[PDB]
Amino acid sequence: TYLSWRKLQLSRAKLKASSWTSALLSGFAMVAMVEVQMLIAFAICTTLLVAVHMLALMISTCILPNPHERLHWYIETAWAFSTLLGLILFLLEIAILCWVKFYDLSRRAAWSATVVLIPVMIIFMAFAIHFYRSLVSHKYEVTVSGIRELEMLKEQMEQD
Amino acid sequence: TYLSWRKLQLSRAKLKASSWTSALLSGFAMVAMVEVQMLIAFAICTTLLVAVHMLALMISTCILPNPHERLHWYIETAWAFSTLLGLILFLLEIAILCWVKFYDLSRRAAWSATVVLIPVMIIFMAFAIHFYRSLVSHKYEVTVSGIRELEMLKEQMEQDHLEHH
Amino acid sequence: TYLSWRKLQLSRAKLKASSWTSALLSGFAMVAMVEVQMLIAFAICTTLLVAVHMLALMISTCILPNPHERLHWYIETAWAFSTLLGLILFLLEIAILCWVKFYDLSRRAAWSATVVLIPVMIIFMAFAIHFYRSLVSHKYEVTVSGIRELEMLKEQMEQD
Amino acid sequence: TYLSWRKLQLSRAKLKASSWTSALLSGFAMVAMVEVQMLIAFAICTTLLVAVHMLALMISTCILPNPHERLHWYIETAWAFSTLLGLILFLLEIAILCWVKFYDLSRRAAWSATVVLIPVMIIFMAFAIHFYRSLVSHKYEVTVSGIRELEMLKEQMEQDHLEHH
Amino acid sequence: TYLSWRKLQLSRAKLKASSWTSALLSGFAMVAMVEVQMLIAFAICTTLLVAVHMLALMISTCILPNPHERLHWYIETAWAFSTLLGLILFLLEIAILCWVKFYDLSRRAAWSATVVLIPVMIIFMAFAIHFYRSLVSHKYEVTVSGIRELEMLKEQMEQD
Amino acid sequence: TYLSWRKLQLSRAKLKASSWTSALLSGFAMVAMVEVQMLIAFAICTTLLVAVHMLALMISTCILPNPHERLHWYIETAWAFSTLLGLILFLLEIAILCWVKFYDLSRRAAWSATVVLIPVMIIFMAFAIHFYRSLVSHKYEVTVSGIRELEMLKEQMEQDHLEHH
Ligand SMILES: [Ca+2]
Ligand SMILES: [Zn+2]
Ligand SMILES: [Zn+2]
Ligand SMILES: [Zn+2]
């Protein structure tokens, strides 16, 4: 009873927070584009960021009406993946904006900013990979896949 | 009990999230329009986006007071459809904006962006179609359904009144 | 018990969502006016939109402290009516803004936009009428009024 | 039990909605002022609107920790009054803005707008009056009420301390 | 049980509302500064306002993990004090902004606005004093301090 | 029961407030950057502020699905640290902005502002240090902790599968 209650309250706080950030990010970004008015990058990025988020939101329109377990994990992962694509894209977007503001003014600063992004982009890229790998395949293989990837790490910290 | 409780908490998280995003998207889009100040597209899109979203919001003004099951599913669906059209229109809106910001500067970028949207637009359009199809069909079933509930309400006042003497 | 609990939680989600959208719409609209700076229309519209919403909000200041049934339905309908007037006015406002942005630039587009609004404005106008008719009169007459309006529709779908 | 529970959930939805709108209106109005950049009016209004709303917010900082009944009703009323003044000031603020945007361009529109407001302003002013009247009256009752509660708190520590030995 | 439940739900509505307003005020103010671009005042004010609020927010990062009673009242008061400093600073900020907008245009209006602020600033200053006095010292002294300050008032209303 | 309930409601209010402020700060800062349009500082700050906050948000995407205790504390801490860095970066961001708005106009004000920040920055930095120190240490403990939980999950499917015949 406590488990089913906790699971349902988690889907409910996830719903409220998903719609929340998806809409606020999407909006703040659209406004960021009209306020300033590699450029193919800026356009595909803004546009992709808003589309990916609208996807997540719709996944919040449809999880509400809806064995059941396998379908709910596929939808859940599709939501989490669309959302993560949204955070990455929002980051890429701020990179491209430092770029666009600084292009004709200071190249050093712009390049510095887009660069400091790489390690975080790595962590982000990493997780996007786990959710994608989780989407096509079934829980087991990815569960073991995960144990392998973690165990190979257990060997590194000890050596040091 | 757990089922009726979960259903009610789902209409309640759906209410709070619906009003939320409808107002934030609508407001943000209107502001996006005034800030820049093929064009017939931009106007019809902004205006349609805001009208469709206000429709969703009102569906949150009226689900609150509310056999009942068929009528509540129709209304819920009118909400999901208004909401989804709003998402589509918002996406369309950001496309036309890349278009408008980039028109005289770089045609390549705008067209590239407007193109990469197509797979997502496909999924969105698909669902818009299913929801539309659910509405047109029960236009019959529901109207009646609503009559039966309103009648029962007219009858519940008649009984409640017969006891006052 | 479940009924009184559901009614109270509905007044509580309605409170939180009312204040939410009333304030966000009002604000977004005020900002839309200062950012651009038939015109009598634009002014009466912005001004009416913010006033109607502030009304709704105050109805959320006063439902909190408060047979009881008849008074709570009159207040509820006053809130719902002020709120609906707010959504319509927000729509009229975006019409007038396409108008104001496009006036000297492209008349075709502006007129097209204010026009596509009419069927939705019909549905909106319709509901504004039900709430107003509910405000002056008592539940019964409007309940029957509603059955009549719906039954006369039942005859149309069959013929086709 | 249901009554005390409902009362507490009402102070809790009132808290969350108060802070909500106070911050959004205040912020949005400040931004409305800097974006345009009879005038004495515009300044006193923006500044009063933001001060009155910050008052409401603080009343949400202090209701959280809190015979008790009289003091809690006074504070609740100080909140409702600060809140209502904020709504009035926001309305006044949008009027002065139609005024300021339209001044040199079209006098007719601004005056028309500032006029249609009058019935709504009447209702708002009315309530502002009732709440003000509730405050001035119990300035006496409550101060004492607060003393009695603070004393009882001083006494509850004295008893709680008498047992430590 | 009802008491511990109410206390916990109060810390929970305080958390959600604190983060809410702290972030919205901070943001609206930063944006107010870049949109316009005694001045030492404007800078120290904007900067202080955002710092004080970020403090409150972090106090919402740390109250979540955490006799216990004395520590929770010191943290609670630190949060309430940072928050109050934030509201005052937001007000001072709007004063300084009327100032900055009106300086070269109408001195009368600017001075009028910063002036109408004083009585409210008094109430604000008053409360900031109670929370500061509560931070350094223990509950008792401040509790009695409070009874004294209130009782000396009881004598004034009667005379009139 | 009350303890597990309180812990779960704390992760739930922390989730809702985390996503809340992360998105509002990030969006507001990006907009602050485009509106003005030593400089290497401004860019790295805006970009770092938005990246760190998106990190926090994602930590709200992943706490939802989730011995367990050690792994949940590590993740919670990664969240608190990403969140705190975000607050620091936002403060740094408003400093560099006073700097940038005031550079050619009044040097005195900008420097005064950037200076008064130092005590607050001290407290923030301090906590950033404690959280960082909690992370680096358990890099060992947790990875293993996670393995043990994932294994147990691999084992729970194996048992659940052994019964299907
Ligand atoms: Ca601008
Ligand atoms: Zn009779
Ligand atoms: Zn003793
Ligand atoms: Zn087998």
Short mmCIF file of N, CA and C in Angstrom, two decimals, chain B residues 45-121:
data_model
loop_
_atom_site.label_atom_id
_atom_site.label_comp_id
_atom_site.label_asym_id
_atom_site.label_seq_id
_atom_site.Cartn_x
_atom_site.Cartn_y
_atom_site.Cartn_z
N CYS B 45 -1.01 32.05 -36.31
CA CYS B 45 -0.41 31.13 -35.36
C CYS B 45 -0.45 31.72 -33.96
N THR B 46 0.10 32.92 -33.76
CA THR B 46 0.05 33.51 -32.41
C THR B 46 -1.38 33.56 -31.86
N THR B 47 -2.29 34.04 -32.69
CA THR B 47 -3.67 34.22 -32.27
C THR B 47 -4.39 32.89 -31.97
N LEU B 48 -4.12 31.87 -32.79
CA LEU B 48 -4.68 30.52 -32.63
C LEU B 48 -4.10 29.84 -31.41
N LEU B 49 -2.80 30.04 -31.22
CA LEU B 49 -2.10 29.49 -30.07
C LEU B 49 -2.68 30.02 -28.77
N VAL B 50 -2.89 31.34 -28.70
CA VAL B 50 -3.50 31.93 -27.51
C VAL B 50 -4.99 31.55 -27.35
N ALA B 51 -5.73 31.39 -28.45
CA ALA B 51 -7.16 31.08 -28.31
C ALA B 51 -7.38 29.64 -27.85
N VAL B 52 -6.61 28.73 -28.45
CA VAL B 52 -6.67 27.32 -28.13
C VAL B 52 -6.26 27.10 -26.66
N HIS B 53 -5.25 27.85 -26.22
CA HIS B 53 -4.79 27.66 -24.84
C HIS B 53 -5.85 28.22 -23.85
N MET B 54 -6.44 29.37 -24.18
CA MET B 54 -7.50 29.91 -23.31
C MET B 54 -8.66 28.91 -23.24
N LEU B 55 -8.89 28.19 -24.34
CA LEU B 55 -9.92 27.15 -24.36
C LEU B 55 -9.56 26.11 -23.28
N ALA B 56 -8.33 25.60 -23.32
CA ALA B 56 -7.88 24.64 -22.29
C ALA B 56 -8.15 25.17 -20.84
N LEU B 57 -7.71 26.41 -20.58
CA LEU B 57 -7.91 27.04 -19.26
C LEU B 57 -9.37 27.05 -18.79
N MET B 58 -10.26 27.36 -19.72
CA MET B 58 -11.67 27.42 -19.38
C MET B 58 -12.17 26.02 -19.07
N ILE B 59 -11.63 25.04 -19.78
CA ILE B 59 -11.99 23.65 -19.50
C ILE B 59 -11.51 23.30 -18.06
N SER B 60 -10.57 24.07 -17.52
CA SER B 60 -10.21 23.92 -16.10
C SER B 60 -11.12 24.73 -15.12
N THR B 61 -11.86 25.69 -15.66
CA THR B 61 -12.84 26.51 -14.93
C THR B 61 -14.09 25.64 -14.71
N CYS B 62 -14.45 24.86 -15.73
CA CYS B 62 -15.62 23.98 -15.73
C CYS B 62 -15.53 22.50 -15.33
N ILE B 63 -14.35 21.91 -15.26
CA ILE B 63 -14.27 20.52 -14.80
C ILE B 63 -14.46 20.48 -13.28
N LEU B 64 -14.02 21.55 -12.62
CA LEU B 64 -14.15 21.69 -11.17
C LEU B 64 -15.58 21.41 -10.64
N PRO B 65 -16.64 22.03 -11.20
CA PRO B 65 -17.94 21.63 -10.65
C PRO B 65 -18.29 20.14 -10.91
N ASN B 66 -17.87 19.59 -12.05
CA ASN B 66 -18.10 18.18 -12.36
C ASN B 66 -16.83 17.33 -12.29
N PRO B 67 -23.42 7.81 -17.62
CA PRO B 67 -24.00 8.88 -16.79
C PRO B 67 -23.10 10.12 -16.70
N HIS B 68 -22.41 10.27 -15.56
CA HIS B 68 -21.44 11.34 -15.34
C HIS B 68 -20.18 10.93 -16.10
N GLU B 69 -19.86 9.63 -16.03
CA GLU B 69 -18.65 9.07 -16.65
C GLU B 69 -18.43 9.46 -18.13
N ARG B 70 -19.47 9.33 -18.95
CA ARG B 70 -19.35 9.63 -20.38
C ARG B 70 -19.11 11.12 -20.64
N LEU B 71 -19.82 11.96 -19.90
CA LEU B 71 -19.71 13.41 -20.00
C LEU B 71 -18.33 13.91 -19.52
N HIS B 72 -17.83 13.33 -18.43
CA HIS B 72 -16.52 13.71 -17.86
C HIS B 72 -15.39 13.26 -18.82
N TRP B 73 -15.57 12.13 -19.52
CA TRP B 73 -14.54 11.70 -20.49
C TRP B 73 -14.56 12.62 -21.72
N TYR B 74 -15.75 13.01 -22.19
CA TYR B 74 -15.80 13.95 -23.32
C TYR B 74 -15.10 15.25 -22.98
N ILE B 75 -15.44 15.82 -21.82
CA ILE B 75 -14.86 17.10 -21.41
C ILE B 75 -13.33 16.95 -21.25
N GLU B 76 -12.89 15.90 -20.54
CA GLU B 76 -11.45 15.60 -20.38
C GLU B 76 -10.75 15.59 -21.74
N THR B 77 -11.38 14.95 -22.73
CA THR B 77 -10.85 14.87 -24.09
C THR B 77 -10.83 16.23 -24.81
N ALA B 78 -11.83 17.07 -24.55
CA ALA B 78 -11.86 18.40 -25.15
C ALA B 78 -10.67 19.18 -24.61
N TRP B 79 -10.36 18.92 -23.34
CA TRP B 79 -9.21 19.52 -22.66
C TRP B 79 -7.89 19.04 -23.23
N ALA B 80 -7.73 17.73 -23.35
CA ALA B 80 -6.51 17.14 -23.90
C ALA B 80 -6.26 17.59 -25.35
N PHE B 81 -7.34 17.73 -26.13
CA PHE B 81 -7.26 18.18 -27.53
C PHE B 81 -6.90 19.68 -27.61
N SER B 82 -7.56 20.52 -26.80
CA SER B 82 -7.23 21.95 -26.78
C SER B 82 -5.76 22.09 -26.35
N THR B 83 -5.36 21.30 -25.36
CA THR B 83 -4.00 21.33 -24.85
C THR B 83 -2.96 20.92 -25.89
N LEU B 84 -3.28 19.85 -26.60
CA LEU B 84 -2.36 19.35 -27.60
C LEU B 84 -2.23 20.32 -28.77
N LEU B 85 -3.36 20.89 -29.21
CA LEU B 85 -3.33 21.91 -30.27
C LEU B 85 -2.48 23.06 -29.82
N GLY B 86 -2.54 23.37 -28.54
CA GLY B 86 -1.73 24.45 -28.02
C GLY B 86 -0.25 24.13 -28.15
N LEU B 87 0.12 22.87 -27.88
CA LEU B 87 1.53 22.47 -27.97
C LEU B 87 1.99 22.53 -29.43
N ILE B 88 1.12 22.07 -30.33
CA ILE B 88 1.44 22.08 -31.74
C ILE B 88 1.65 23.54 -32.17
N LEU B 89 0.66 24.38 -31.88
CA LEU B 89 0.72 25.80 -32.21
C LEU B 89 1.93 26.54 -31.66
N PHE B 90 2.41 26.12 -30.48
CA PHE B 90 3.58 26.74 -29.85
C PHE B 90 4.84 26.36 -30.62
N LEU B 91 4.85 25.11 -31.10
CA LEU B 91 5.98 24.61 -31.88
C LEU B 91 6.01 25.35 -33.24
N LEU B 92 4.83 25.41 -33.86
CA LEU B 92 4.64 26.10 -35.12
C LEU B 92 5.10 27.54 -34.96
N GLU B 93 4.74 28.12 -33.82
CA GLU B 93 5.09 29.48 -33.44
C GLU B 93 6.62 29.72 -33.37
N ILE B 94 7.36 28.77 -32.79
CA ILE B 94 8.82 28.96 -32.71
C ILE B 94 9.47 28.78 -34.10
N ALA B 95 8.85 27.94 -34.95
CA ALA B 95 9.31 27.78 -36.34
C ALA B 95 9.18 29.09 -37.13
N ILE B 96 7.95 29.62 -37.16
CA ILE B 96 7.68 30.90 -37.81
C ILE B 96 8.58 31.97 -37.18
N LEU B 97 8.97 31.82 -35.91
CA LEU B 97 9.85 32.83 -35.38
C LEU B 97 11.27 32.69 -35.89
N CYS B 98 11.77 31.47 -36.08
CA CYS B 98 13.13 31.35 -36.61
C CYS B 98 13.10 31.97 -37.99
N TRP B 99 11.99 31.72 -38.66
CA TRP B 99 11.68 32.19 -39.99
C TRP B 99 11.79 33.71 -40.08
N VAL B 100 11.07 34.37 -39.18
CA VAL B 100 10.96 35.82 -39.14
C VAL B 100 12.23 36.53 -38.65
N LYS B 101 12.96 35.92 -37.72
CA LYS B 101 14.18 36.53 -37.23
C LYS B 101 15.27 36.41 -38.29
N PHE B 102 15.27 35.27 -38.98
CA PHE B 102 16.31 34.93 -39.96
C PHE B 102 16.05 35.29 -41.44
N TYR B 103 14.81 35.66 -41.77
CA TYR B 103 14.38 35.90 -43.16
C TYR B 103 15.35 36.68 -44.04
N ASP B 104 15.61 37.94 -43.68
CA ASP B 104 16.56 38.75 -44.44
C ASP B 104 18.03 38.46 -44.15
N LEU B 105 18.34 37.72 -43.08
CA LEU B 105 19.74 37.44 -42.76
C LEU B 105 20.32 36.11 -43.28
N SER B 106 19.73 34.98 -42.88
CA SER B 106 20.18 33.67 -43.36
C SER B 106 19.02 32.70 -43.64
N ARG B 107 18.66 32.50 -44.91
CA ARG B 107 17.57 31.57 -45.26
C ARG B 107 17.80 30.08 -44.91
N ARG B 108 19.06 29.66 -45.03
CA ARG B 108 19.50 28.29 -44.77
C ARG B 108 19.15 27.75 -43.38
N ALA B 109 19.42 28.57 -42.36
CA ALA B 109 19.18 28.21 -40.97
C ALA B 109 17.69 28.01 -40.68
N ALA B 110 16.90 29.03 -41.01
CA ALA B 110 15.45 28.99 -40.85
C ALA B 110 14.86 27.74 -41.51
N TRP B 111 15.20 27.50 -42.78
CA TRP B 111 14.64 26.32 -43.46
C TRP B 111 15.09 25.01 -42.80
N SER B 112 16.36 24.95 -42.38
CA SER B 112 16.89 23.76 -41.72
C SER B 112 16.07 23.43 -40.46
N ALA B 113 15.87 24.46 -39.64
CA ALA B 113 15.10 24.37 -38.41
C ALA B 113 13.66 23.92 -38.71
N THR B 114 12.95 24.68 -39.54
CA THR B 114 11.57 24.36 -39.91
C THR B 114 11.45 22.91 -40.42
N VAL B 115 12.51 22.39 -41.03
CA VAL B 115 12.52 20.99 -41.49
C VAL B 115 12.71 19.89 -40.42
N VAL B 116 13.71 20.05 -39.54
CA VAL B 116 14.01 19.04 -38.50
C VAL B 116 12.81 18.77 -37.58
N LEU B 117 11.85 19.69 -37.60
CA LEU B 117 10.62 19.59 -36.82
C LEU B 117 9.67 18.52 -37.27
N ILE B 118 9.79 18.15 -38.53
CA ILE B 118 8.80 17.28 -39.12
C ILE B 118 8.52 15.94 -38.39
N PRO B 119 9.55 15.22 -37.87
CA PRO B 119 9.15 13.98 -37.18
C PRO B 119 8.30 14.17 -35.90
N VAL B 120 8.65 15.21 -35.15
CA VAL B 120 7.95 15.54 -33.91
C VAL B 120 6.52 15.98 -34.24
N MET B 121 6.40 16.89 -35.21
CA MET B 121 5.11 17.33 -35.72
C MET B 121 4.25 16.15 -36.15
#
